[PDB]
């Protein structure tokens, strides 16, 4: 039932920066009682590469980064706006890729009591991907 | 002279306190077991009057503690016994 | 200037300081008593979401304690273990001689994180945190306590666990812990008995996480 | 670090024949931290399997994972025409995440 | 009965001591602000007599402290109140 | 009213207690040297009676300590002085 | 409910609580005295093998102390340094203000290991461990103490070293240390003076280990 | 045997112990007061060079404290941070509850090194170091204090920094710190006001070190 | 005057285990006030190899092992029965050897006072050796 | 570790001639921790010498040890027919024990 | 205005020892309120080599040594005698050199207030140098 | 350690021509810790410059230092006959001191 859609891409020059966003719905809010969220990129012709993920606040709200983006990319969230952001600095043309947001979520079992969702350490929901082009 | 002005009052008290070889620390009970227990009801308005008293004595007690330097005060009642005597036989 | 109650065969009176009552005989020091009463007896809300809004942090003011000789059984005691977002502790370790309150029915243990602005957590209404036989102006880490007040006069558990986020601020959230991976969103309309009933039906029926993810339940609004 | 390498780079089998693809990790890992993904052009990868042997939902029974230590495999009991996708490994490592390079399955 | 034998005396005292929501530790003042203040002059020789008294009581106080084991003594004046009463009504 | 029922009794006591610049902590004696000393004999049965008293007071003292929360109690005798006065002039 | 002795020009009486004696004048608080007496004055055995059987370990009970104003010289004081088999400590460090008993004739210092079942070592007969001017319900590590009792009333060293094994249990063994490599098997029939005499003849005559091995002596049974 | 002053409508008398004064009424314990007075009120020199000669170190004697209910404002308070030549500390950390003296005009903070012969620094004349509302026989590290004495009776800052060398001995030297690299030789003839005036003219005029070396000033002898 | 004699040997299959024993006399008891005891083995044609030793209780009662037997052999004692034991697990045919018990003891000087023994950090007393054969 | 190596592997001397055997340790060791043992077929090794230079009892004066650091020697002032045994070094190392390989003495 | 002059040199045999001295004036005393002092040596035909320096007492009174003289040379001072000393032990013929004392001092700005000096972490004042010959 | 090496070993220039001498340190150092010295036979070295760029007093303006990191230079805007001395680098390192080997300047 969970969906997230990427935006904020397009053409940026190397040496610059940009911030991508991914706004979703279908969950229970993405800040608390929710899966953390990651960015993954895939350059055309290449497999997916992990960028990093922001943990939910109940799990501490920290960001775990992939080695290739350390000290350049920042993963952060707009709490209660259900929006994930990626700040990419020090851009190089090697960063041209399709950038995806990804979520470890989905609905769980119900009971006469109430409703439930699961928050995972892997991805069930992928966005569409926003293409980011870095070029001269 | 006590007017209970609280939104509500639990009219009764369920209380605890601390009153052969049993007396020897080595053979006696562990700390969780050194307490006694029982109930009291609101005989003649006493319990609700008492709850209001504790609510009123709080301000005086906090100002007292602000002024002193003891980390732990065990002497409030000993001072009261002394003042009682000085007021009658000073 | 601390008032004493006097118990008569009439009612409870408050002793004066200007008026000497010749018949108010005191035969020994064993007739003087320090009594710790709980705030719950006055109808204060006891659910975790409302309770924590009565507490807050401050610096520049040292903690102090006083003793009890007797006191009430509590229906609701609290036990906090709160850390800062950087992993450091918010509350001080309890010093020697401080032990938890001996007679609690339900203990609400809250573990979590949040901003902790001061050095110590103090009660905002000036009430005391009640430890075994000592009232304190502050909360000690990991120690079970009741909220209350102390009277002076002349005489003649089930452990419920919660997680917390943003503990020291105004807008905070709580979860009821069923298992390591199983939680229920907490609301102010839930009583301790309600939570125990939910823990039995969920746990007994197996409606718990099986995968490594966290399963978060939301109570039907009705 | 803990790095995933797939082999063979390309699988070649007629539809209806059995297919297997393996990954070797540079570091030993518990079963609960493994997954494989299925990708077709124009689509984000589908989860398929997680926790080494637990199927993702919406996935046919013909897909089954196994393995331990450093060696994990995805077996498709009968590979259907619709299953000739690029497959990837993934591991959680209890913190950093790693993806495999991508293996193509062809008729 | 006090003869001030000091080289000199400051004849006056500039002193400090500790006497709605203000009473609540949470809202009240920080420790540096809990003190009051004022001045007293040498009315009828009182201040210089007092300085000499403090100079004479020092020997007794140090011997007292040598003998006791309390790390901090807060009880000297309570003992005085008790002896006062015992001497009159023993 | 004290009957010594011990297997044996040392009839005498060898005891110690704590009673110009000597008063100044800087120049005075080290802790091992602040004690006095002497002997007492069993005059009129006093020493063996005293040993039996200490043997009987032990139970009351241990129960007392179980009930209190002070880590160190220095106030037993001050309480006794107060009760003495309250019983006579209450 | 703690009794007071009263010293008269007749004998020692025990003060009542129900009977007021009008002639039992108390003129000041300086007439009240706390006195620490030793157990050895009642004939209790003082050899190390028998002494340690009066002590044992327990948990769940906190330690507490009271003061003395005066007390006895001890012939036999003890000082323990006992470790668990894994090298950790059995006894707590003494807190500030606790100092050893000031007037001991022989100090029996026992170092060694054994099982230590509880948190603290307590006296089994309810006697107190006497430290400088403080009686305690427990033994502190490395501090010299006497065993004894405390009376309240109205008034008008040579250091002998031992090694121990199995210290906290019923079946234990001890050695008297003459030198780092020289020991004598200990028996309950030995007095402190006996041990000193053995230390002089053995040490003076050179009947001590010369090699790196331990020389263990056994007293002739007669 | 500690004397009490008695305040009358005549003068201040010293209460006896042998003579009972029937008219010396005590109505409550609130009429009893502990007062901390400063030594500076008796004309003792307060400059750092002379002050430190009244202090010294000793071992074998424990520290002790007493409380105040009221006391004087000090013109001159001191704060020491003294280390041994090997970098270790000379003074103990202050224990919980000890806070600096609340009302000081000038604080003389002395940092430096020197031999520290004992365990604690004690006052040589037997005066007490005055901390917030506690007099002490010893100096605590890093805590501001006044020197003084305590009376008992019946009732009816600018921070000046110095460096020190050889702090605990007889022949020592001091410098007044203007900046990290700027110092003035200290003399006993300088008053706190003098030092502040020198700090303003030197600092304001820029007569301070610019290079990485230390600039040491010497006051004209006249 | 001290003697100790080995037993519990003979043929065992590799992959199995056995426990050897050595019972002695002539000492003052082997548990307290006594030397600790070691095992040493010597395969025919080879020199002696240290296995390990159990300390006396007065010295802590621990066992110090030789590297070649770590995690396979255990040296222990039956207190007050004057008997030393060696538990050899995970047997390999390389373990065929004569297994000896050895003691750092012997009598010391006497005095009109009493009797005495020395307990050493080297061996004075060797047993006879029990042959242990490990084979298929 | 601290390991003992003997040299020469075999000594050859007529009875009545002097004989010496040395051991070199891989690590320096104090004198008090050294020993040599004498073995004949059918017998457990005899102690001979301990503590580098202290004789074991029951041992003739012709046997004398010496050494320091890593280099220790056993000297037999006159080797008798009864002394043509296999000799071993031993060291205590204040905890682990080490034996030498065994040196044969022949006529 | 500061001057320091070296002495105590001349011929010493290798395997022996000697103590050099350097006494100065023109400063404010060399123990307190003063620069620490160093020794530097220069063999004929070679550049200067740092030996070590004694800090002033206000700076702790310790000695910082150059690696080539560690455990052989000691730098110390005769407090209030304005004299620097160098104790050279375990002499080798390689130690033949001219030995200089050196000071980080000199006068600073004055004011109507008083006089002033600077104490540096580098050298402004060099002595003349005393030749020390080590030979057989 | 932090070691100074000068280059060129010898400078050769007519008086009135500009001259530069550089030092390379084995370790990076802040400007405030550097100095150069001027030596003639029979004299102890003169300070010249300290703190990389701060002139010592008694020194002509033609002498000016510069540099950062590991690379420092002394520039003489016009080298006079009286300036044909041996020059050395020096560094303080916030504790150990190091001197350069000595560079000769010749006409
Ligand atoms: C002895 O007995 C008396 C009588 O019962 C008790 O009196 C209570 O006093 C507390 C305050 O100390 C009252 O609590 C609430 O105070 C709020 C005002 O403070 C807010 O804003 C300030 C900043 O301006 C903050 O610093 C502060 O933290 C608060 O955020 C009021 O706004 C509250 O009213 C609102 O909320 C309540 C929720 O229950 C609603 O019922 C109200 O209608 C309203 O929407 C509130 O007044 C408390 O209400 C008083 N009790 C009664 C019955 O009136 C003493 O505290 C007690 N002493 C002890 C030691 O126990
Ligand atoms: C005030 O004065 C009185 C009178 O002197 C003292 O009374 C003594 O009390 C102790 C017990 O507290 C007596 O000591 C011995 O008690 C043993 C029973 O306990 C054992 O078994 C239990 C388990 O069932 C264990 O928990 C416990 O640790 C013990 O192992 C008896 O079995 C002992 O008797 C045997 O040994 C003695 C050794 O001396 C022999 O003489 C006996 O004949 C017998 O074989 C023993 O009774 C002690 O004996 C009492 N004294 C007297 C004179 O009778 C108070 O203790 C004292 N109070 C204080 C604070 O000092
Ligand atoms: C209560 O009030 C009285 C009266 O004012 C105070 O009395 C003062 O007592 C101190 C001593 O405790 C006097 O101080 C000086 O004592 C020196 C002797 O001790 C030295 O030598 C011994 C070794 O033999 C050392 O251990 C010790 O540390 C000292 O080094 C005298 O030599 C001093 O006299 C010289 O110096 C003074 C400096 O001011 C000169 O004025 C003198 O002329 C002389 O050259 C000095 O006497 C002090 O002087 C006494 N005061 C008065 C007015 O006489 C009590 O101390 C005070 N109590 C409290 C608690 O405050
Ligand atoms: C010798 O003489 C000099 C010269 O007057 C004195 O130096 C002054 O010392 C005071 C006290 O420390 C300084 O006052 C405070 O400085 C704080 C730090 O500010 C720094 O950063 C600012 C830029 O943001 C610079 O302009 C400033 O120079 C510092 O580098 C300020 O934060 C303080 O203001 C705040 O707190 C005070 C209460 O403390 C409030 O009243 C204010 O409203 C505000 O909230 C404050 O300014 C002062 O700045 C120093 N001046 C200079 C020129 O250095 C020496 O202390 C003196 N020495 C002796 C022994 O007398
Ligand atoms: C918690 O307190 C913060 C202030 O510290 C509140 O934030 C402000 O809320 C008002 C609306 O009432 C806005 O106009 C301000 O712009 C906000 N300020 C900031 C800094 O964000 C917050 O609303 C409070 N939350 C709750 C639940 O009471
Ligand atoms: C020390 O206590 C233990 C029990 O903890 C005693 O051991 C038992 O002794 C009886 C004989 O009295 C045997 O029948 C039991 O089988 C033993 N039990 C165990 C677990 O060993 C021991 O005898 C006591 N020792 C001494 C000296 O009193
Ligand atoms: C500080 O105390 C020392 C002693 O510890 C004094 O040193 C002695 O001074 C006398 C002169 O009065 C000489 O005759 C002795 O030879 C010195 N002894 C030693 C060991 O040096 C020192 O003079 C005192 N300093 C001050 C300023 O009082
Ligand atoms: C929760 O953690 C405990 C260890 O603290 C473990 O014993 C228990 O099995 C865990 N439960 C689940 C569901 O993982
Ligand atoms: C015992 O040990 C001490 C060191 O703690 C040493 O000084 C002494 O010589 C030793 N005695 C023997 C016999 O080894
Ligand atoms: C003195 O040190 C402080 C840091 O403690 C620094 O902020 C200040 O600029 C320094 N002043 C000088 C002159 O170096």
TrEMBL record, chains B, E, F:
It is found in: Host cell membrane; Secreted; Virion membrane. It comes from the Viruses. Residues 13-87 form the Envelope glycoprotein GP2-like HR1-HR2 domain. Functions as a decoy for anti-GP1,2 antibodies thereby contributing to viral immune evasion. Interacts and activates host macrophages and dendritic cells inducing up-regulation of cytokine transcription. This effect is mediated throught activation of host TLR4. This is Envelope glycoprotein. Signal peptide: none annotated. Belongs to the filoviruses glycoprotein family. Disulfide bonds join 9-48. Interacts with host entry receptor NPC1.
Automatic annotation (TrEMBL), chains C, G, H:
It comes from Ebola virus. It comes from the Viruses. It is found in: Host cell membrane; Secreted; Virion membrane. This is Envelope glycoprotein. Disulfide bonds join 77-104, 90-116. Signal peptide: none annotated. Residues 1-222 form the Filoviruses glycoprotein extracellular domain. Belongs to the filoviruses glycoprotein family.
